[PDB]
Design a protein around this nucleic acid. Structure first.
Ligand code: ADP
Lengths: 96, 109, 96, 444, 80, 97, 85, 109, 96
DNA sequence: CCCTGGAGAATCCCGGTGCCGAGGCCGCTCAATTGGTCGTAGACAGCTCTAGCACCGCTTAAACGCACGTACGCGCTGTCCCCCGCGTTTTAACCGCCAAGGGGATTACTCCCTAGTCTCCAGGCACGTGTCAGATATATACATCCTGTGCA
DNA sequence: GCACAGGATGTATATATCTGACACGTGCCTGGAGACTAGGGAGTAATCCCCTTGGCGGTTAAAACGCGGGGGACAGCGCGTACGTGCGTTTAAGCGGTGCTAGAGCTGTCTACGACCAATTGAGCGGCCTCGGCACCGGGATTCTCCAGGGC
């Protein structure tokens, strides 16, 4: 067989079934969502890398991710994303 | 012996692959080291944004009396929200069309 | 016989094409134009169908946005017809 | 065996003996080829001694060469009048005015160069440095030498950039903070020996090193008047709102950048902040007094003073505190006067003259501590109230002796209001350390 | 070959303009629009061909087109 | 009777003068006050390096100059000589702000 | 008990200053409503830039805003500034 | 017997610091490995661009009748040149000013 | 003693003395030149990094640098700089 | 000068089709677990320079308020011309189908190029220091603008 | 109603002083060059098969073209308003100071805790194959619009 390909399709489908239990998605819409997720990941990761370089630090951390989120997303989305990420990190720290 | 493997995504109560995100951060040449919390934070942010956009797109799809999300629904959801229009201002969606908007001077009088 | 005023058919077409979501240029002429433009940089260039489709999508999106800016400039000039001067002003303000 | 009598070239009476001894001191100081500080403070005037030195040079020596005197704009006219009255032979020229007047003056008098003494101000010197630098200078006089106490300042650099063969500094308070400014002054006087910035090992060496190029007298040779001062420090506790804001700021919307500066006025009055005021009606009644311990004590003290000799003076270092005190005084039906930085010269002088009338109905006079012009003859007053103390004990003493002018013939009493267990105590301790340094170095 | 720029016909330009939201179109708009399309396409295709030549390939991919658009600030979601 | 220039020559002379010079055309202390006032909302107890405010003033003046150029182009497009808020709004709308 | 406000800070961007900026832009005649609009535009621009700068400063664990932070903010906005570092 | 330490800038005939460029590439997190000829190529490109800008700025300095280059001369050189204007289209040069340009309609007639 | 800062000022001065012998430069102009060189280096290096990631390699080469130059620089500058870089690499390889 | 009345366009409820998304299986590779180490960043301590807050002083340039005249923005009108709506003929897009082969994607192999380490040494940087390039001022010399006047 | 003189204004040009930054010299130290070794990434050859290109024929929608007409573009005219220009006045900017104290950068140490690397491994995820529901296409009946003509 040919080379396997990686995509966020399974997790996008899971979150879709979670938010709207009785709604499907098309292949083109899934490709759009996959490109969207890759692009957002690229933006956040690049901004965090630049932050670490600016502050003369050699590691990317939760502080860098949070600061990149506040720099890139506008306003209310930034607030919600910060709260959700902090919730996830607190739960991961408490459960490990 | 070793305990049954517990996914870090399940530990954080997420649904996006934190392990895959950590690998992508390590292979992406962003920095030399990656902390433990950065993959979890990034996966949560990605999941939140995906949930927001998919919720708006699903509402738009139900407004058109369909059950499948299509690029038209995605474009409607993105362009009819200020925050998402700012985030995706310079993005083109394949077969998304345009928002219906006619300047009022052109309307018959 | 029956006949329409000069401008109602245009408004109906505006609604139709702002409600539709497909492409609006002919695929074979666009493909031939793309190959002709690519003639100047290399010989015996081959293309994927997806490449031509993506080029057509981007070209149409750019042209639609340009026409929206042109219409805004024309309305600013207290006109309903759009003109080459309107297109040139839009390009100049954009930075092209 | 020196200039023991009043000169023959000085007019309008003879110089007094305690002045003519300083005159012979200056005369011998030139022949000895060293430059020193005249620190006799307010006697009968260092202006007459300096004019006598210049006149002695020009008459007895054949050196009428270019001389410059650097005085503040407030004393420029007084110096010109003294030149015209006492020793009229010297042809002093005053350079002050806008750009057109400066250019006209230089091209019409300064470049022709018929003058002998040029009296100018600090600002005019900074503006006309380029054309003042050309002339060779035989005598440079800087009245109020404490202006150049700090090195690496524009005036301090420019003044020594000139070509001067003699130097002289006049100051009544040479020492104000520490010995580095004294070293700066001595470096200006003669850079060749004080090149380095650095009671048997000390004290005596300082005295005998400073004696050769410094002199100071005490305003007690004649006396016969000017009763001494009584200094009382009143410790007043913080009020409820003062205490709450004090704790709040100490543990810390309001902007609080400079912590010491924010604790200070807060010890004074919480109304200098935002949100500590009562309701929007802004009713001025008993809110000002009750919320400040100093205000309560002041409301207790003032009626006693007005039942007594009265004519009280108030010194404060914040114009907003002045505003609050003014509002309280106008609410309590006390007629007052205000001297402040923003008060123009005409209103300054008119208020001073009105208060100085022997039969005056005005009771309270409020002055900002440093906003004086180093003159201000408020000799008709009796009580000096120091609402807050400066870091400079010499600034405090100058504000204190502002009421100790020669026209004052009654005992004057000073009240310092201090809040116990605050930063006011640290202010007082620092001022006491600086004052003991001043006394041990100069007076002893 | 040649004479392929004129394959972008007047009706297609009118359809694009109607989707833009205009009602009356001047007669000289068509040549201007063809020139604008030509310059835009030339830039994008130049970048895509550069990417393809670095890849050492004879075939232009949708990936190459997407990368060119992204480096021109005109991101395209829907192809990868 | 007194000599007066016509309405528009002094404007052209000023245009040439300010298109020749390079200094800053906003008062530094008012600009610094404005920057501090704006920053106060985002955070309290902030200190500014003097270079930061200078860079902010440079960027702000460049932005305003470019905006005014595009506004003048729009006004000339409308067959006018005066610039108006509608022209400024059109320029910002085209640029995407 | 004495309070007296002076003026808005944004009124410090004066009418002659805006006129000078317009002259550099190349404008001849100016309408009287331009000044309020320009003050609003400057306010929005500064708010965005200062938000980015203060975000950088807070990440750096500091309370002083630096020229480097301003440069990084402008570079994120897409208005690269040369000469300040 | 160690040969004379001869620098790679002189080896390539450049005037820019090839060694510093190589160190910056290695520390900058662009890829895990760097070729030998890449820093030489990059230094050559940087030198050409600097030389072009400096030549144009010196010509502008001669036009203004001065022997020193200032940011005004740099801005004058960067504008009036199509290639450099495209390259630095969104760059602000501090205390650089604007080109003299008056629209034809505004001129008196 | 103050710390050490790295600047391209020496090499900029060398290029200036080579191309315009009897000329000078001010501190602000030198700072602008430093920022310009840093910006160009950053753009070219980032483009080469993305190229290496796209083609699935872990080595930045002169080929990657040349492709990044052709992608960034506009036309005549691109070709002149490519010729210069080829000459420099030829000199480096041939004799040293 | 708004109120019928027809054409034409769009919308809504039904029915047959197909094809693509959702579901269920198989195999693999990649993440999770456990163990060990190191090196980076958090913490601390000492120094040196900048910034904030409350003032003071002086100087003077710039903002402000005002009055007046004059271009100019804006509305109204007339003309024409050109763009639009519609019908007819022509042309090639499009869809389906087929055939052939270039080249993209993959695998195995081996080399050669780069990372890493050690050692030595000279280029680059901070610090002083003097002198000249340019900013400023003044004083002519010329280019521009505006107005009045004279004339055909 | 047009074209020139001159007067006032502004702007350029030449030259003299002076000062504050730039260009150069010096000491030294830290990063770069010379030499070597090890290992895996990338170049090279060969194979497969898939995706590209060429070609043909039939339908039919879309394009090209022509005609007739009404609406919009544009030039012109007049006016009442709002802005440019110059002037006298006020105000706050600008510069130069005080007095203290914290903040930040740099240097120099220390230590421990978190991140990297390795071997093992089983569970997760990607590819594949199949089938029913959703979307689509086609059709008939119905509402809503727009335009023309007239008695409102
Ligand atoms: N005619 C006079 N000659 C000398 N001294 C006088 C005369 N009249 C008054 N004085 C003294 O001069 C003092 C005031 O002058 P002062 O303020 O010392 O001058 P300055 O300001 O120059 O120091 C008074 O104390 C007074 O005793």
């Amino acid at each position: 067989r040919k080379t396997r390909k990686e995509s966020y399709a399974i997790y996008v489908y899971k979150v879709l079934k979670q938010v709207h239990p009785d709604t499907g998605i098309s292949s083109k819409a899934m490709s759009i969502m996959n490109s969207f997720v890759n692009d957002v990941f690229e933006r956040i990761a690049g901004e965090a890398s630049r932050l670490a370089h600016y502050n003369k630090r050699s590691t990317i951390t939760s502080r860098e991710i949070q600061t990149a989120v506040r720099l890139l997303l506008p306003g209310e989305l930034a607030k919600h994303a910060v709260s959700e990420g902090t919730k996830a990190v607190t739960k991961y720290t408490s459960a490990k | 012996t070793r305990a049954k493997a517990k996914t870090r995504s399940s530990r954080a109560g997420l649904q996006f692959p934190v392990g895959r995100v950590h690998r992508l951060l390590r292979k992406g040449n962003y920095a030399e080291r990656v902390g433990a919390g950065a993959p979890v934070y990034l996966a949560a942010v990605l999941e939140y944004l995906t949930a927001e956009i998919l919720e708006l797109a699903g509402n738009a799809a139900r407004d058109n009396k369909k059950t499948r999300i299509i690029p038209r629904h995605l474009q409607l959801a993105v362009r009819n929200d200020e925050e998402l229009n700012k985030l995706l201002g310079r993005v083109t969606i394949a077969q998304g069309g345009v928002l219906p908007n006619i300047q009022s001077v052109l309307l018959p009088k | 016989p029956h006949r329409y005023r000069p401008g109602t058919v245009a408004l109906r077409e505006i609604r139709r094409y702002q409600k539709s979501t497909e492409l609006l240029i002919r695929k074979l002429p666009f493909q031939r134009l793309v190959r002709e433009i690519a003639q100047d940089f290399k010989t015996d260039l081959r293309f994927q169908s997806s490449a031509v489709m993506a080029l057509q999508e981007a070209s149409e999106a750019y042209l639609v946005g340009l026409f929206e800016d042109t219409n805004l400039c024309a309305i600013h000039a207290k006109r309903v017809t759009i003109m080459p001067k309107d297109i040139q002003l839009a390009r100049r303000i954009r930075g092209e | 065996t020196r200039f023991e009598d009043s000169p023959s070239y000085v007019k309008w009476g003879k110089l007094r003996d305690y002045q003519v001894r300083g005159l012979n001191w200056l005369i011998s100081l030139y022949e000895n080829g060293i430059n020193g500080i005249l620190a006799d403070e307010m006697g009968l005037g260092k202006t007459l001694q300096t004019i006598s030195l210049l006149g002695y040079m020009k008459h007895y020596r054949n050196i009428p060469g270019p001389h410059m005197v650097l005085v503040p704009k407030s004393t420029l006219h007084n110096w010109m009048s003294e030149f015209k009255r006492w020793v009229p032979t010297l042809r002093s020229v005053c350079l002050i005015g806008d750009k057109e007047q400066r250019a006209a003056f230089v091209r019409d008098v300064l470049l022709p160069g018929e003058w002998d003494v040029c009296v100018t101000s600090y600002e005019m010197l900074i503006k006309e440095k380029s054309v003042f630098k050309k002339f060779n200078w035989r005598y440079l006089v800087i009245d109020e030498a404490h202006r150049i106490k700090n090195e690496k300042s524009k005036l301090s650099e420019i003044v020594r950039e000139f070509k001067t063969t003699n130097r002289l500094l006049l100051t009544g308070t040479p020492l104000q903070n520490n010995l580095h400014e004294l070293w700066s002054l001595l470096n200006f006087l003669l850079p060749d020996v004080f090149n380095s910035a650095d009671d048997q090992k000390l004290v005596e060496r300082l005295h005998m090193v400073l004696r050769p190029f410094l002199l100071r007298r005490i305003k007690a040779d004649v006396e016969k008047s000017l009763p001494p001062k009584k200094e009382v420090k009143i410790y007043v506790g913080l009020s409820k709102m003062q205490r709450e804001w004090y704790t709040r700021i100490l543990m810390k919307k309001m902007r609080l950048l400079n912590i010491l500066m924010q604790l200070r006025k807060c010890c004074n009055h919480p109304y200098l902040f935002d949100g500590a005021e009562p309701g929007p009606p802004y009713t001025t009644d008993m809110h000002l007094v009750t919320n400040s311990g100093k205000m309560v004590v002041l409301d207790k003290l003032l009626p006693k003073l007005k039942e007594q000799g009265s004519r009280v003076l108030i010194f404060s270092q914040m114009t907003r505190v002045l505003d609050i005190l003014e509002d309280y005084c106008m609410w309590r039906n006390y007629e007052y006067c205000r001297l402040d930085g923003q008060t123009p010269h005409d209103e300054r002088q008119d208020s001073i003259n009105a208060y100085n009338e022997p039969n005056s109905t005005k009771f309270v006079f409020m002055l900002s501590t440093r906003a004086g012009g180093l003159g201000i003859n408020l000799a008709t007053a009796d009580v000096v109230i120091l609402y807050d103390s400066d870091w400079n004990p010499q600034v405090d003493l100058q504000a204190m002796d502002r009421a100790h002018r020669i026209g004052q013939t009654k005992t004057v009493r000073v009240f310092r209001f201090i809040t116990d267990n605050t930063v006011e105590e640290r202010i007082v301790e620092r001022a006491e350390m600086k004052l003991r340094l001043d006394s041990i170095v100069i007076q002893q | 070959l040649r004479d392929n720029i004129q394959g972008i016909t007047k009706p297609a330009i009118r359809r694009l303009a109607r989707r833009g939201g205009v009602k009356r179109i001047s007669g000289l708009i068509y040549e201007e629009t063809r020139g604008v399309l030509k310059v835009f396409l030339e830039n994008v295709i130049r970048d895509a061909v550069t990417y393809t030549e670095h890849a050492k390939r004879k075939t232009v991919t949708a990936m190459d087109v997407v990368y060119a658009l992204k480096r021109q600030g005109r991101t395209l979601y829907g192809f990868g």
